[PDB]
Design a protein around this ligand. Structure first.
Ligand SMILES: NC(=O)c1ccc[n+]([C@@H]2O[C@H](COP(=O)([O-])OP(=O)(O)OC[C@H]3O[C@@H](n4cnc5c(N)ncnc54)[C@H](OP(=O)(O)O)[C@@H]3O)[C@@H](O)[C@H]2O)c1
Ligand SMILES: NC(=O)c1ccc[n+]([C@@H]2O[C@H](COP(=O)([O-])OP(=O)(O)OC[C@H]3O[C@@H](n4cnc5c(N)ncnc54)[C@H](OP(=O)(O)O)[C@@H]3O)[C@@H](O)[C@H]2O)c1
Ligand SMILES: NC(=O)c1ccc[n+]([C@@H]2O[C@H](COP(=O)([O-])OP(=O)(O)OC[C@H]3O[C@@H](n4cnc5c(N)ncnc54)[C@H](OP(=O)(O)O)[C@@H]3O)[C@@H](O)[C@H]2O)c1
Ligand SMILES: NC(=O)c1ccc[n+]([C@@H]2O[C@H](COP(=O)([O-])OP(=O)(O)OC[C@H]3O[C@@H](n4cnc5c(N)ncnc54)[C@H](OP(=O)(O)O)[C@@H]3O)[C@@H](O)[C@H]2O)c1
Ligand SMILES: [Cl-]
Ligand SMILES: [Cl-]
Ligand SMILES: [Cl-]
Lengths: 297, 297, 296, 297
């Protein structure tokens, strides 16, 4: 019922997730340009496969890069093409004023050539809805890791979730629902109250030492050094640390290794564990945002 | 072990709720002056019953007032006293610099005489943690209200909760727990996304009309008149509206009435339904805040 | 699902029976309605008559109210100024396959049905009714819990006695409401189940030790266990909601002497949620009545 | 407090599971003869490692065998032994009257030589509480399988669980807690009601074909040919079938493979997925039962 006819999009690069986007945009009758897909028989009606120097940027209303957009040299990551794909300044200049670029995470090079071309760059992984929606595949990732790195059942174990942010809330809820005894560490009184209303056990992150002495699994959400040497000193090798924070994560890895503590940094859970879902999530937010651009012209 | 020894505090007036407050402060060995409690059948450890004119204000580190501090002319509300208790400007002036006045909701008279006295006034109900803790007693209230004004079972019914704010989140989780088919309406994309992670049905409040056409119970949270004449026009008399938003609520009651719709505004639900717990919440936050004041000197 | 070729007598009843008649007319059963003269709306394909005016020879089922009848055999109508008595001969004129449905147990009814060689189903005794009914019964228990305490169900200490049909529902619901629930049973399988549901299990032999410091004790066991020696550990702080059938599972006269509020709550579904209660009945009957029709 | 002090027990072969069992019995100060573990890197307090011919059976109060007790020729499975342990009739014959033998599942050889020795044989897996305790580690195994065999999230999918028996209950409950949309098929009036009170969608299995047309995941718990060719012909390749029932499950796996449908048989999930919990579950039941033998004598 909601359409995107009279828009012209370039999908440059991607993985299993971009397929969901492409699927979505063709359902919404956008005019689609595909670069980085020459190998795959996607089965996507109407879509036109070409290189980056054969895209008519003059007419392009939007560019959809992959989640981790570009390397140093600015090469776009493809998985369904052998030909290396590179995004240049010049490409973004040939582009209308109202043209918006979409990517997942930050990148000095992409922010550069976008500020330089005076074109808007939306960093999806920074919106709340994307983080929140993405917490779902990320719990499922976390559950998966815990199941396969322990000899015991999640149910009835002692589980700490560090931080009650957009994902922490989801991790703690789902772990509790799975039957674990879940405790949560936060700092704001608001988070501590919510924890208790959710029926969980709250501790302040100042007391992290005392509250992880004897826990079975410790899941970190805090994008900072919280699982410091002083705190790991109190832990036993009975504890699995699943650290979900963005690199360099939240835990003194060298020290843990020393103490015989398995501490895993697990970047990119959604893409790894549920690409159809991870993909549908971006596709849906993207279809909402593109629609707004279209209503204005 | 967390104590409150070197502390002078007046507790002036109160409900059943205040009984919990005194209880905690006296467990914590504070020095207390109780006015408005002559009619109470017992005492507390460390506190005297006296008059406002009897208290040594020059030394008081904190004053505690009822949820609803004062009525115009300075009268403090008392449930446990025959004698009318009036708080004067002169009282607060006699007070040292660091002294904190605690209350619940806003009140013109109190704010005046306090700012005038150059003394800090903390209205506890504007804090997030209070609001979040209180949402629990308030669902219980709302559950109560739903059981009595319906001849059907909450379980398996259609319930809308409007708003995923501090309390709305608790109302939604709880009616879901209890077996209703809960949809929740909100405006922000993060709310919309969280409503889905919690396994509920989200809608945008711009669709309010369409999503309340056929529901059994519509619990409102939003401080704005969203249940307006035009939304109600296509609701049926079969709907119960339970309005928890503060005066003036969220609904065109007058119209609902004509339409044959039971819409009920339900203020101060924590106070009515679980006075002990309502009181225990205030006490617990009050404790924390006084430990801070005690730490400055 | 149609009861097209089925003659059914509904005799006496309350709001709930109306619900059944509704559903049974929806399915185009031929209904005979006795003890409903004081009612002013009718029912499609239903004839209001006297008990002595029904062709019992052709009735395939007979439906009585929840509390079947008195010792003298008079059915409890709410919808008639006139007194209706069910006799042995009514049931003898009835065909071999005719089923009498009622709710609870009754000596007179069991006797006349047995002497008539006629199947008497007591619905409140069947698992599904017990289970469907457990829902409106928690809500009732919740209700009582809310109005009889000054504290919140959330974060309280709750004990539920018996993981039977209703107790199962009573525990999951209270736990989901954020109460700390522990449940006493006796069989190992019940204790396993309690453990899986994430709740704290104890054995009813340990009952004195496990109810010292609870806030609400909810009872489901139809046998005396909240007794004088147990009760003597508990303190007036504790609230007992005994849901078991009369006499209950509590030494109430003792709870009295100790100052413990202990309530007997019979017939919660009918009180808390009459529309639902009647639908539960209605729906099972319709499922059951089709089974009868499936043979002839 | 519950001690097994005056008791002589032989533990003959077994898994990592048996370690938890031994750990428990030794903690209860039983006297243990441990055969099948020469190759374990540590020992236990109060138990000697030995050979079956070294066991003083004439005094053994009880013999504890592996989950799958024994082969046809009488060999006992040992994962911690080079040497081949074989259990003879003569061994049970030497044993005293009250002596009880414990094993996991059924098996003829054992069954036979017990009966012929006139000695009590308890098969643990046939117990209600074992079955239910094990359901927990088994859902987690199932969750794992779901996660590893799909490219989408469990949250928000269509899940069908077949049967509400001892494990079906746990399975249906836990996938629902994961945020799936769970329907469950049973046949008793009583199970159907239970399902509905559980807040899930019930159906009768007579209707299976109808209800699995659009499911993402189908979990069978029924030890009968239910997921048959005629049912399977309605399904689409998109569906994943997890068959948890004992070999040969409830599926036409040969038809399912032809139709392009992945269907898995997943035997002994507790053992694979959480051996510590499997073991502990077994020990706590064993401990409780050996206490009955001790009381009797
Ligand atoms: N592994 C993956 O595939 C994956 C998936 C999703 C997210 N992530 C990463 O995981 C991290 C989690 O962030 P998020 O998306 O959940 O959003 P978020 O809302 O920012 O989560 C961070 C939370 O941690 C709290 N926090 C920060 N410092 C703290 C401290 N010292 N003590 C106690 N609490 C503290 C913050 O609360 P306050 O307001 O109290 O400071 C904030 O609520 C991010 O770095 C994100 O990139 C990774
Ligand atoms: N009687 C009682 O038992 C009692 C007890 C506690 C609270 N209350 C009342 O309940 C209300 C709820 O407040 P709270 O403390 O729960 O938290 P809150 O944060 O104040 O909740 C309000 C929520 O409504 C949303 N909202 C506001 N205006 C909207 C609009 N015009 N359309 C759609 N959504 C809108 C907001 O979302 P955005 O952030 O997107 O704006 C916000 O999340 C307050 O009025 C409070 O006075 C009553
Ligand atoms: N007043 C109302 O509104 C209301 C509503 C519904 C039901 N009820 C009544 O409340 C009772 C509830 O029974 P129900 O329908 O839930 O089904 P139920 O299956 O009878 O529940 C009873 C459970 O209690 C257990 N039990 C009996 N004696 C025990 C003992 N001495 N120690 C430990 N456990 C014991 C049984 O377990 P075992 O397997 O160990 O024997 C059984 O599982 C019935 O009497 C019913 O009439 C009242
Ligand atoms: N792979 C593993 O790790 C693992 C783990 C545990 C169990 N299992 C296997 O899975 C099966 C599960 O049984 P369980 O332990 O969960 O206990 P169970 O109580 O016997 O489960 C079977 C349930 O299915 C229902 N049922 C039986 N036949 C049916 C049919 N034809 N149509 C519809 N429903 C039917 C039964 O209800 P009714 O009363 O109507 O007959 C019963 O409640 C067992 O065979 C077991 O060996 C495997
Ligand atoms: Cl704060
Ligand atoms: Cl927004
Ligand atoms: Cl038993």
């Amino acid at each position: 019922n909601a359409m995107l006819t009279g828009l012209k999009i370039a999908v440059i690069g991607g993985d299993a997730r971009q397929l969901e986007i492409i699927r979505k945009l063709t359902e919404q009758q956008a005019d689609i340009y595909l670069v980085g897909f020459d190998q795959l028989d996607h089965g996507f009606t109407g879509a036109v496969k070409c290189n980056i120097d054969e895209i008519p940027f003059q007419q392009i209303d939007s560019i959809i890069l992959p989640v981790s957009a570009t390397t140093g040299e600015g090469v776009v990551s493809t998985v369904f093409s052998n030909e290396e794909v590179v995004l240049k300044q010049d490409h973004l200049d040939r582009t209308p004023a109202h043209c918006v670029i979409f990517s997942g995470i930050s990148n000095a090079y992409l922010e550069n050539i976008a500020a330089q071309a005076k074109r808007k760059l939306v960093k999806l992984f920074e919106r709340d809805d994307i983080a929140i929606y993405n917490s779902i595949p990320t719990v499922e990732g976390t559950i998966m890791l815990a199941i396969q790195h322990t000899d015991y059942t999640i149910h009835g174990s002692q589980v700490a979730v560090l931080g009650l942010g957009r994902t922490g809330m989801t991790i703690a809820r789902t772990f509790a629902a799975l039957g674990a005894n879940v405790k949560v560490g936060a700092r704001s009184s608001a988070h501590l109250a919510r924890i208790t209303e959710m029926g969980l056990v709250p501790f302040h992150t100042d007391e992290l030492k005392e509250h992880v002495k004897d826990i079975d699994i410790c899941i970190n959400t805090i994008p900072s050094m919280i699982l410091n040497q002083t705190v790991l000193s109190s832990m036993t090798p009975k504890t699995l640390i699943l650290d979900l924070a963005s690199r360099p994560g939240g835990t003194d890895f060298k020290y843990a290794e020393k103490q015989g503590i398995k501490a895993l940094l697990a970047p990119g859970l959604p893409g790894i564990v549920a690409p159809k879902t991870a993909g549908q999530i971006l596709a849906n937010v993207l279809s909402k945002l593109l629609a707004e651009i279209q209503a204005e012209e």
